[PDB]
Amino acid sequence: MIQRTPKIQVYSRHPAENGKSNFLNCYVSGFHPSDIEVDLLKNGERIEKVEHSDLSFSKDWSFYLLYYTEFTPTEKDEYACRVNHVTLSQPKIVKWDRDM
Amino acid sequence: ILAKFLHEL
Amino acid sequence: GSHSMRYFFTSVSRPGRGEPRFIAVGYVDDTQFVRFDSDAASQRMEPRAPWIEQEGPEYWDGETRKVKAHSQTHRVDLGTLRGYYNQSEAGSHTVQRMYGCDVGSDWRFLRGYHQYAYDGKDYIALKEDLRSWTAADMAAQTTKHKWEAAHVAEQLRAYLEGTCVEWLRRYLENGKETLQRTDAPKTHMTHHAVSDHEATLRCWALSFYPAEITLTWQRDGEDQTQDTELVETRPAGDGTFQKWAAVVVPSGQEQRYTCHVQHEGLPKPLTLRWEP
Ligand SMILES: [Ca+2]
């Protein structure tokens, strides 16, 4: 068995401009085994319509997936990705930084 | 296109 | 220049009498073009790129037959491996397989691949001569012996050097408007104070294709890894990729740092300096 915890990046498709429609992405990678739960959140509440890519993997056999949803950023709203995986004690929450 | 068949391990 | 076609398969067992999940995805270069997922409604191979949709019902019927046969092979293999490693029925286990071919600028065969993993580790793979195998352990040695006796490598080689290359060329032609493009990175730098005596510089590469890219920081022309951070290259979601690299620097010394970007799309490596 070789298990691995997920790397998580949270980011926008396009550079963020407040009040303009865009896509919020949560890219989870480097994990094993493949079962994973991912929630996109706005101000701590689940975002309703989230889609995801087909499961694939990298050269070291670790899996990756993209989750995404439409959003319109503002200066005040907080967006985050919350991920659960067998390797984690509790779910990991990564907050969106528009310059990361 | 996929391979036409695979051998079992 | 060069191009690749790759198929990626994952099979995951489920405890007791649950059936295994099977996922298959195919790529030309960094572009996904087909998928199959045993949990999904269709139970068919499905298109994931506009240019493959022009293939007719014979293509989709054949590929669906084959991907189902692939899933049956992996189902049997999960069983075989459970015995080889002396494992109970209570746990879930994973098999992964990747195969495919690369062609050069002239679209002739460059290399072929066929690799297999169990529970996240190398199990067996075809060596680059496509005639011999590398086995990770005693279980895989059993498989190597069986595959030697059955001349499996010779059969794969025919696929990897023949069928794989031909269909890759057909795809490259049919999808020419989107597969034969390179999108050079759009680049910029951002700056943020992290205290009254340090600042972060972040060099960004956006909207690029294919995914392979190198970002490096230099200080006074000397390579710099101390106090840098590089993220994995990530999909934007629209067929291109993104990456950034950052360095923490003394305030007032931002101009000593340069970020260097290399990508197939650039006729020369780019050099960026904090310009505001
Ligand atoms: Ca079962």
Numbering used by the authors:
A (entry chain B): 0 to 99
B (entry chain C): 1 to 9
C (entry chain A): 1 to 276
Authors' description from the paper:
Here, we used a well characterized CD8+ T-cell clone (ILA1) that responds to residues 540–548 (sequence, ILAKFLHWL) of human telomerase reverse transcriptase to further investigate the structural basis of TCR degeneracy. Combined with biophysical analysis, we demonstrate the molecular mechanism for antigen discrimination by the ILA1 TCR and model the mode of cross-reactivity with these APLs.
In contrast, in the A2-ILA8T and A2-ILA8E structures, peptide residues 5–7 were flipped so that Leu-6 acted as a secondary anchor and Phe-5 and His-7 were in more solvent-exposed positions. In both peptide variants, the mutated residue was at position 8, distal from this structural rearrangement. Closer inspection of the structures did not reveal an obvious mechanism for this indirect effect on peptide conformation. Both A2-ILA8T and A2-ILA8E ligands underwent a conformational transition compared with the other APLs. Furthermore, the smaller Thr-8 side chain in A2-ILA8T, compared with Glu-8 in A2-ILA-8E, would require smaller modifications in TCR docking. Taken together, these structural distinctions may explain the extremely weak affinity observed for ILA1 binding to A2-ILA8E compared with A2-ILA8T (KD values >500 μm and 28 μm, respectively). The unligated structures of five APLs with alterations in these positions demonstrated that the overall conformation of the Cα peptide backbone could be altered by introduction of Thr or Glu at position 8, possibly explaining the weaker binding affinity between ILA1 and A2-ILA8R and between ILA1 and A2-ILA8E.
